[PDB]
Design a protein around this nucleic acid. Structure first.
Lengths: 103, 534, 30, 355
RNA sequence: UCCAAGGAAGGGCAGGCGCUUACCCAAUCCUAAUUCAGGGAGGUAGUGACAAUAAAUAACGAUACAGGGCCCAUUCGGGUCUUGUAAUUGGAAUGAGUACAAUGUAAAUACCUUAACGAGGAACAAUUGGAGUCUGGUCAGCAGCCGCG
């Protein structure tokens, strides 16, 4: 960020992670280019699934990790997460409190 | 960005603004419609012959549209194409679980400028508690759904409805606030039908029979990209099928001429203009002597260094002549290559909101692909190891699958709409939603992993030296399959050592651990049998 | 949404702890 | 089956025009007056190369080969290895899939085997440095031709590997109205089984020709000996001009037959390079059919291309007539306002996805 | 601005968004062609998490089989056993909401009152969370024998 708390960007590609508990499953990262800057930064998706949900080429919102940078656990080098794809606030789609738009 | 950009410039007053008044059929929508044209035409027209062209100024022309909730296909069809959805409500909807599913249809087709209008609340409520109910329904929609929406509250003043400031507030919101662009609708040329005429090539014995199609001449105005760009092109008519245009019409020494006049040889084009096979890549040159002598000097390259339409058809055939009616509105679609072609396609899916059933492979589905809708058997599969290893016959709450099926083939991977049909006497809407997502990817000639289980129970086990009481009955099968690698439900490897002349399930076979009596010796990788075609 | 919570709210939620603490601290102080 | 074509003319063109369009066509009357009527050996193996990368494609050929019904499938590709006949070099077979490279679902990793050069088809440096930097102007960022062995006729013995990594959905819009300025001229003189001094004989022939110019002359000597040289002795030379401002190239090529003068070969390819500069405006005349394919297949937008009247020949006109039989596309030409020369502007609307 | 082609007419003005305005001369005063009536004077209605007020979600009995019950020290161990599992089951009760009449009366609405309805757990449907050495599911990759997440 430019010192800010949030920023809006566009997904260009979707990467792959993996886990150890309770089994090995993909834990998902992406590459998101900043709209205001053009910088493409890695971002993590904290949830189960939601690789199904987000997309390529969608305009997303970004937030921090609450550790002043500083990648959380065994995720090497990601400093940001997505809270709102298309401004739809991921947790609403997480239960079924919202339905994804046309794109 | 550019596909919305091409739409704004040529469109002006003769392309109208799309107005779709969509709600329940039980309400008096017609009073609000004729009230709306009482605002448009001076004060005195209250008759419905829609759809029809109403001329109102040079700013915007406005054609008004209607459809009941009893028609099933146009409930889909008007949703993807409307610039304006006008929802009228009664004071008793909100947890009516069978007649409000169209909201999710407009969600999946994409939300235009949409409206909530409450008028029968006056007919239903008469106390101060309706002010809380209005805000509560506002907490339901659209303010829950989309930020920046307005809820319109109007009077029940049935026939005899106002010309006053309230219709200027509605038409204020319609005229001032404009739409938002859609991705793939603007990627296609699409035309709504306005005037429908039929010519029969005057009377002959060939003009009627069991199979005779006549000359349907249709008229209207264009939207989206310009449709005249190529004659004889393909087209889709919704509810009837795919066709091609008979004739397209629209009512709103030059070497470049010499190229595409095919009655003239190219040597005559060059010869009249100035003064063979591209399989040889090396271009033509002159002789070594002439090019050497001419290129003795290098001076010659020294600077080289530092809208209304009249559309003709010979369709439809005879059976839809009996399907003539006052026109329930039909828009024309557009077919494209790499979308007109067929293929096995894989789609990504999730489950409908307020949906209460499981979704099986064996129950066919209606599928809205753009301007198309196909009943198709939805075969599901899943991965668990970044590759296919299993398949599922139905859709639980546990996970949500990916669909693979032979349908039409579409490379650009459009968004997905899977609707399950109900009759017009079951719930209240024309369809009930099954699953929605995006077309995931394109994949033809693919084969599904269908694995099964062979049952063998162990009772007294050593690592390399073991017998099963009951897993088989033939020593010949085990003798053919002794080179294979047998497994166990916890993951213990093994192979068949030998059938050992016992067609009874007892046979020597090795494992890398002694098999647990709570475990079962199994076998996987089984027959992948064919796709359902429909 | 989870159908797990059945436990009391507010005053009855305040009611249960003081009954528990009356059982807990009496053996604790002894 | 419906779009009817005639003769064996533009055989690789008509197959690729049907493949990218997804349209069924028909080609009939192929060498019907000839003593050996129908398809040749390389034309049969051409469609064998088609079948190796596609899926859902249906090819129906008459028993004498004079009539071919082609119905295309999807472009899949992948990794494979093809054997080319002695009738045509591998540069005959690189040329059609360059059109098919960015639109593939999986990357092209294809090893060719056989003769690598002729007098009529394209050379390797004409592929590597003549046609591959041209598609780089359209966003083809990563493309690689890995020459493992060189193959000299009649015996060949060469291996080349195509590596394509950039996959796009449409090319970018052309914007070319000015004739570019050439900064420097380089080249590759190569040989098989013979002396490095014979390469220097080709070097001294062109430096006799091109010492008069005020640009740089830096020709790379490409000597090969061992198992990496093939089975036959021979030599060739490709001389490429450079526009280092944007990345425009102009090249000339020929190979050397046994007993010939390699100095005359160096003189000829130098003067053919000079002549092609005098005949071109933006692209070479053989770079031109590479470009015009990339015009139509792009997104729905208006582009511009500077062309020369010397580029306007019978090969060019039939090139425009083939696209209208497939895509119904008309090229719109406006002359330049310049009075120093007589060029005109090729304006072609890309198809996008319009039916 | 219009034009029947002659001429005629209005002053570059409000207001909205960008950051929905309805009713009455019953009051006070003023005027009156004045005991009549009017008042772009005046009076009433619409508008809502940046804040924020009061507090509703259950109360009290009942019996029967029943106890390896809890706390602290991650410990090595010690102390304290008045405790729950059952609609067993029973009568209370209030008002969220439904409604005559009256008051008020700018004509007039709300406000302040109240006959008549409204509980045995589907009730008359509250969370956002935090942990978890719990319970389940064939996977780097491996045999000679025992195992990994």
């Amino acid at each position: 960020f430019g010192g800010s708390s949030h920023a809006k960007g566009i997904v260009l590609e979707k990467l792959g992670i993996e886990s150890k508990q309770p089994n090995s499953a993909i834990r998902k990262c992406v590459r998101v280019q900043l709209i205001k800057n053009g910088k493409k930064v890695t971002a993590f998706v904290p949830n189960d699934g939601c690789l199904n949900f987000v997309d390529e080429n969608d305009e997303v919102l970004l937030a921090g990790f609450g550790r002043k940078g500083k990648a959380k656990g065994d995720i090497p080098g990601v400093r940001f997460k997505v809270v709102k794809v298309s401004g739809v606030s991921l947790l609403a789609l997480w239960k079924e409190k919202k339905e994804k738009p046309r794109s | 960005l550019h596909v919305p950009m091409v739409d704004r410039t040529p469109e002006d007053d003769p392309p109208p603004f799309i107005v779709a008044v969509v709600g329940p059929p039980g309400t008096g929508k017609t009073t609000l419609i004729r009230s709306l044209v009482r605002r448009m035409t001076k004060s005195t027209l209250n008759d419905i012959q829609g759809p029809i062209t109403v001329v109102s100024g040079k700013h915007r022309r406005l054609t008004f549209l209607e459809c009941p909730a009893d028609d099933l296909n146009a409930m889909i069809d008007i949703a993807k194409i409307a610039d304006l959805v006008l929802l009228l409500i009664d004071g008793n909807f909100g947890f009516e679980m069978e007649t409000m599913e169209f909201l999710n249809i407009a969600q999946h087709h994409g939300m235009p400028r949409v409206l909530g209008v409450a008028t029968h609340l006056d007919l239903f409520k008469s106390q101060s508690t309706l002010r809380a109910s209005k805000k509560r329904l506002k907490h339901r929609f659209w303010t829950e759904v989309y930020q920046g929406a307005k809820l319109f509250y109007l009077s029940g003043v049935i026939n005899g409805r106002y010309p006053d400031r309230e219709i200027l507030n509605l038409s204020r919101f319609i005229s001032v606030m404009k739409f938002r662009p859609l991705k793939w609708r603007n990627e296609h040329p699409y035309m709504l039908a306005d005037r429908f005429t039929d010519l029969t090539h005057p009377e002959l014995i060939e003009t009627q029979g069991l199979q005779i199609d006549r000359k349907v001449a249709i008229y209207g105005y264009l939207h989206g990209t310009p449709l005249p760009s190529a004659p004889g092109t393909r087209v889709h008519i919704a509810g009837v099928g795919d066709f091609s245009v008979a004739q397209i019409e629209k009512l709103p020494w030059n070497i470049g001429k010499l190229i595409y006049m095919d009655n003239i040889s190219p040597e005559e084009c060059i010869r009249r203009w100035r003064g063979v096979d591209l399989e040889k890549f090396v271009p033509y040159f002159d002789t070594f002597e002439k090019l050497a002598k001419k290129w003795k000097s290098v001076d010659a390259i020294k600077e080289r260094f530092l809208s209304y339409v009249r559309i003709v058809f010979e369709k439809v055939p005879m059976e839809f002549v009996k399907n003539f009616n006052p026109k329930f509105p039909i828009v024309m679609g557009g077919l494209l290559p790499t979308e007109i072609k067929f293929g096995i396609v894989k789609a990504r899916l999730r489950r409908h909101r307020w949906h209460k059933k499981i979704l099986k492979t064996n129950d066919p589905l209606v599928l809205s692909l753009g301007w198309r809708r196909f009943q198709t058997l939805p075969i599901y599969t899943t991965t668990d190891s970044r590759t296919r290893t299993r398949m599922l016959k139905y859709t639980p709450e546990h996970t949500y699958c990916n669909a693979a099926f032979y349908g039409p083939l579409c490379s650009p991977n459009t968004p997905f709409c899977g609707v399950q049909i109900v009759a017009n006497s079951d719930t209240g809407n024309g369809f009930r939603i099954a699953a929605t997502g995006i077309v995931e990817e394109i994949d033809v000639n693919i084969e599904i992993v269908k694995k099964l289980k062979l049952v063998g129970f162990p009772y007294k086990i050593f690592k390399n030296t073991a017998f099963i009481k009951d897993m088989f009955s033939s020593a010949m099968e085990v003798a053919r399959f002794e080179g294979a690698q047998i497994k166990t439900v916890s993951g213990i490897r093994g192979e068949i050592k030998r059938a050992l002349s016992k067609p009874e399930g007892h046979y020597r076979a090795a494992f890398e651990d002694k098999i647990l009596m709570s475990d079962i010796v199994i076998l996987r990788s089984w027959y992948p049998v064919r796709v359902k075609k429909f | 949404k989870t159908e797990k919570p059945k436990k009391p709210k507010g005053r009855a939620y305040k009611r249960l702890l003081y009954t528990r603490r009356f059982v807990n601290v009496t053996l604790v102080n002894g | 089956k419906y779009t009817t074509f005639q003769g064996s003319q533009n055989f690789r063109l008509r197959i690729v025009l049907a493949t990218l369009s997804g349209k069924p066509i028909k080609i009939e009357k192929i060498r019907s007056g000839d003593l050996n009527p129908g398809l040749k050996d390389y034309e049969v193996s051409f469609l064998r190369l088609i079948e190796s990368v596609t899926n859902g494609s249906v090819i129906e050929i008459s028993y004498t080969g004079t009539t071919v019904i082609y119905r295309p499938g999807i472009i899949v590709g992948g990794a494979s290895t093809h054997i080319c006949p002695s009738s045509k070099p591998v540069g005959y077979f690189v040329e059609p899939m360059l059109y098919l490279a960015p639109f593939s679902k999986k990357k092209f990793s294809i090893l060719f085997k056989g003769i690598t050069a002729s007098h009529n088809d394209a050379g390797i440096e004409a592929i590597k440095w003549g046609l591959m930097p041209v598609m780089e102007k359209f966003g083809v960022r990563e493309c690689a031709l890995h020459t493992l062995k060189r193959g000299s006729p009649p015996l060949g013995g060469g291996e080349v590997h195509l590596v394509v990594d950039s996959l796009i959905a449409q090319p970018i819009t052309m914007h070319e109205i000015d004739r570019p300025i050439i900064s420097s001229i380089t080249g590759v003189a190569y040989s098989t089984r013979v002396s490095p001094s014979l390469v220097n004989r080709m070097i001294d022939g062109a430096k006799k020709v091109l010492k008069n110019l005020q640009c740089e002359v830096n020709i790379t000597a490409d000597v090969w000996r061992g198992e990496n040289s093939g089975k036959s002795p021979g030599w060739g030379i490709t001389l490429v001009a450079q526009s280092k401002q944007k990345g425009w190239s102009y090249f000339a090529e020929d190979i050397g037959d046994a007993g010939s003068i390699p100095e005359e070969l160096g003189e000829k390819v130098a003067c053919q390079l000079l002549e092609e500069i005098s005949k071109s405006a933006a692209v070479g005349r053989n770079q031109l059919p590479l470009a015009i394919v990339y015009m139509v297949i792009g997104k729905e937008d208006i582009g511009r291309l500077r062309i020369n009247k010397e580029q306007i020949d019978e090969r060019f006109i039939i090139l425009l007539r083939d696209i209208k039989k497939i895509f119904n596309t008309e090229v719109f030409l406006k002359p330049v306002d310049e009075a120093d020369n007589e060029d005109m502007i090729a304006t072609i609307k890309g198809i996008g996805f319009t039916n």
